[PDB]
């Protein structure tokens, strides 16, 4: 640790002089101990002229005292001398014309010392930015020039500092104020210290540094003055480490290395006063995962019961430092709701708010109104001796004193507007008031909370009205400590204490204990240690002896240093690696600037009306806010300059919202101020109804379809009804460990799902509709340790002492290892196959490099954290591929390029993608640009898209954006009819075929029929049907297909498809526990594929590179060699000597597939490949693919016999043929029909995609050929692989030939395609989705397992705090949830993922997920 430690803060954030008071008190104590003289005695002979820099004066005086008395040697001496020189520099007057320059320099030196003194400490970019801001705040010069001139002027500065130090020392070496103004001079150096000491700082001023006892005084001062010239003269030596010259040299070196509102003034002190109170902030920067960092109090808040009808939660709050509540009737140092009160002390009146924070008040409050700072709540008296507290809102709290105005208790509360009120009835015994009954006379309901007491007058039971079963029960020890609390559900929480009311251990309702240890047994003792019973999260806290800093050591002794202000606000956090996060606050403690650990800077500006008017984003984007005379946010201007307008009703509710394109949304609210009606920009009207509790009970969409929710009197969701009158019923446990929690769900088909939870809500057992059980086990600390599926196979999790995932054991017992560096960041991942990924981080802590066995991925970032570029270097061959990205001021990807492509994205004022240029840079082909145009309706629905060759696709929408017709070149190709759920029940195709779809009770496709709208005997039109039968787990058990006959499927307990019977083919699939197909037919084959990379399957043999990519597939008579680029993308395939080359754009979208002379171009619209153009000597054609709305399911293909006509990088060709797709329940094309409705193409494919037989009327007609397969899959005849956006799928082995780019986020088995291809798709090759149940009622449960919300009354107490974190604008309000009602600001239609990686140094996702790889 450095010998000298400093608290550097922005000067604007300090309003009190408490630190100055402590420094003055320390100086006075030093004088009394050494010279035995008070400051008054030395005042007379202390006439010295210095600048009016109070911080510099106090720092210099204290440093001189320490130098004279607390002599030091070694590096500590150098550091202390450097700090003394810095303080003296900004104190001497001499050249007054340079006073401001010196005053600005001194905090500069303080900051340089703070960054550089610590071991392995270096000047970072954030430090240089802070120095520049501080310099520009006052003089508005240049950092480099100022530092250079200071370096040149350093010698004279040191001489002046030595003279000043000599003069100061020649005051106490012989036997006998609040303004930081560079233009003012201090006549006497001692006088300002005395003036400071006089003020009533309201802060403890006990000196924290004990003088040397030995009263050297004159002798020590003489030795000081003797050595001061020697120590300061050597300060100019740049060779010596930890000296001002060295600090300047290092800062200049860092500036050189890194160069390839009215600023922010900084100040520093070496001695600080103790934090007066904890901050209102409860974030991770102010308290432990709880011990408050500012004051060290151990605080636990436990809720014993909830009154939903009034939204009241009985919150018991413990505070280990609350000796004022030692006699609390709910346990020593415990606070219950409404227990807040005002007590008389020597200083005056002490008020303890509901949260437990203490605010001192003057004795004059009982005679006049008083307002507290930084909080905004006022206290005023009344002529009757009661004090009214306005905490913010319509609630007024009345306080009465029952003993000579000593203790004021809360007797009643007033809601002046709503007339709601609460009375407190107190039983007065021996002039001691004991709360007896709480009267909740509220419009919601009338509740009578009565308390039963024991012989000690301690609440042992809380009763509601006349109910016999108490809402809570409490037990106490002989010392009055609350040792057991039973909640309304019968669950128990135990508490353990030492002999001094200090909570040493407490258990949650499952018995899992949290332990606390304290520095001492005194009430004001800080908690210094906490750990879970098993030892996890063992946190040690060490408070700095001199500064308002605490070092918080995690379970591995990795320190995080927090600095807090006099009011407890954490203004600076320093990590172990040296990265620092700063908060700048103004005089009102409003966060004006935040510089995060990764260097992102956010600024916030406020006007004279205390309104947030400007936000400057890290990327430099400026958000501006404007307000009307009523203080309502009317105008929002985003970084792109687009303007959002709002208008308000009388209740300060947003009634009208105008977006930058002029589209208007209107809102109506009930007297409750709850959204009751929204009129969209197209005139559609949505209706919302609420029950008396304020819970939404009915929602009618703009199409008139109404869904309803039923709640019981208590307010628990008992049933919800869909627009098609299907009811899901919810039932809750009435007994046991999960009493009051969701126990079972009854679905409209009558099938039931059962849940079992522990007392804390953890899911322990899930029983699905088929009765199959999934069990979850949790370790001692409560983290998930084992998930046992219905197959009895288990996935085990092992966590390190900080809760980070350490080892993941899949069903095959293969281990996924996660390694973290001494700073706790993820630096190593070992996959199930043994592949090791090593992560490195740059000076900003962002993922710098991913080192895989073959490829070194390197990330470059913009200052705002967006990925500027990625490079992929082969560690052996050395070949490098790079990608570049650009973003607009809204952080939206505006350009992305790689070797073979550049994509430019253009957006309108709403952020909707309107134009997209796709520049193809294919080798051997002339560059060409494909341009997409998009148009949207007033609701943001895409209605028109112009494809690169001029062909336009039109979407006709009704209501909120439901598609009822699709037009191709203003010619309808399909029209849709939808049911009350807006699901397609009928479609009419332009080829005269109509398809009707029916759904069963749970919303699964039950049948689909296709037939001619008007039958004609001239030709055989396509008529077919599929009838779907499901099992109790909603797995497709049978299909009645008119063409294929009966298709029978069997599944394993976890829903994996293991058999398929049909007339064409019978298939049996054997999976290992991890989900790999195993060659069960061959005995020699392994029973499990431990590495999830099968080496052989049914006559096929695979070889992999070191990154898991299949490099060669060998079978009888075929040898397929696959060449992979540095991004694990197939760039060359060699099938029996036939070479095919591929290329991809930045987003992994395949742009071309070149085989000898034949070239196949592909074009994409978002995630859909919308056209393919074939080029060759003989044949040229272009095919367009039209898909069902918002889906990967193809609708039709149309094309012309010519290569696509695209713009050449710096007249529409009529479509000749139309072919209509007919897909099955999972969106897989099964047949295709021509414009006359005749079947021209049929496919029989194996269960996992392999083609078994294709029947085509016209074999050589390209427009009647189909390569589309499972959603998002494109069959490649060259390799027999299915291209799947990001990966190539291998139908034979039902797996991808490369590892999932997103790792475990896409599933435990990073090579498996889908468990059940009858209903799951995986269209992009990243994540498997259940397509069959996407439109199912079971997939719309308002309460899945714990999705319950009840916060009807947060009112009671509240303070209002924007002083804790920076405000993220995002959508601003969002408004109402549920069916979806409310928008504003933000929003990006047609979102674009830069590279889909973004991140990946993440873990601990509970449900299967490890990385942050998007």
Residue numbers in the entry: 14 to 189, 204 to 287, 305 to 333, 335 to 1255, 1280 to 1483
What's the publication's text?
The type VI secretion system (T6SS) is a molecular machine utilised by many Gram-negative bacteria to deliver antibacterial toxins into adjacent cells. Here we present the structure of Tse15, a T6SS Rhs effector from the nosocomial pathogen Acinetobacter baumannii. Tse15 forms a triple layered β-cocoon Rhs domain with an N-terminal α-helical clade domain and an unfolded C-terminal toxin domain inside the Rhs cage. Tse15 is cleaved into three domains, through independent auto-cleavage events involving aspartyl protease activity for toxin self-cleavage and a nucleophilic glutamic acid for N-terminal clade cleavage.
We mutated the equivalent two aspartic acid residues (D1369N, D1391N) to asparagine in a single construct (Tse15NN). SDS-PAGE analysis of the purified Tse15NN showed only two protein fragments, compared to the three observed during purification of wildtype Tse15. Indeed, the 22 kDa toxin CTD observed in the Tse15 purification was absent in the Tse15NN purification and the Rhs domain fragment showed a corresponding increase in size. The identity of this toxin protein fragment was confirmed by mass spectrometry peptide fingerprinting, thus confirming that wildtype Tse15 possesses aspartyl protease activity that drives self-cleavage of the toxin from the Rhs domain. Unlike wildtype Tse15, particle processing for the cryo-EM data of Tse15NN showed only one main monomeric 3D particle class with the clade domain predicted to be retained together with the body of the Rhs cage. Tse15NN particles were compiled to produce a map to a maximum resolution of 1.77 Å and showed that the Tse15NN quaternary structure is the same as the wildtype (RMSD 0.860 Å over residues 14–1395, A chain). Clear, connective density was observed after L1395 and the sequence of the toxin could be mapped up to residue 1484, guided by a difference map as well as the unsharpened map. After residue 1484, significant breaks in connective density meant that the C-terminal of the toxin could not be placed into the maps. Overall, the position of the Tse15NN toxin was similar but not the same as the wildtype Tse15, and lacked defined secondary structure features. We also could not find equivalent density for the helix that was present in the Rhs domain opening but did show the toxin peptide was still in close proximity to the end of the clade domain.
